[PDB]
């Protein structure tokens, strides 16, 4: 996808930590978050791995979907 | 919307700049960037002036849309 759902994102705030934080890791990344899901989508050259590895190191331990 | 052109949101890096300024202004808000188009959609309770104002004051100049 890339997809994950962050069970820790539990509102707008929280979201937009996790916004910044990729964005920070990859400033020509495409981020979408929704908080009535939890679902974050990625469009990155990253892999998943790298993704989720800064998103747990931030508080927000993702699981790929 | 609200939408904006930006027209100085030329790279995946400026628009990075533009949603990281606006999520700043109101956590709360979802911001899409497309850099192919230059467009910003915002779902934000702020004005479309607030939104432009902040825009305008990091160099990121809008239109509404
Ligand atoms: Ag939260
Ligand atoms: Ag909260
Ligand atoms: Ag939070
Ligand atoms: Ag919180
Ligand atoms: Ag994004
Ligand atoms: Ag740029
Ligand atoms: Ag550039
Ligand atoms: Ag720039
Ligand atoms: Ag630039
Ligand atoms: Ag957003």
Redesign the interface.
């Given at each position: 996808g890339m997809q994950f759902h962050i069970d820790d994102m539990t509102?707008?705030?929280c979201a937009?930590t996790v916004?910044?934080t990729i964005?920070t890791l990859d400033?020509?990344?495409?981020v979408?978050?929704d908080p009535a899901t939890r679902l974050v989508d990625v469009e990155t050259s990253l892999s998943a791995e790298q993704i989720a590895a800064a998103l747990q190191k931030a508080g927000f331990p993702p699981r790929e979907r």
């Open positions: 509102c707008g705030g937009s916004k910044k964005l400033a020509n990344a495409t979408r978050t």
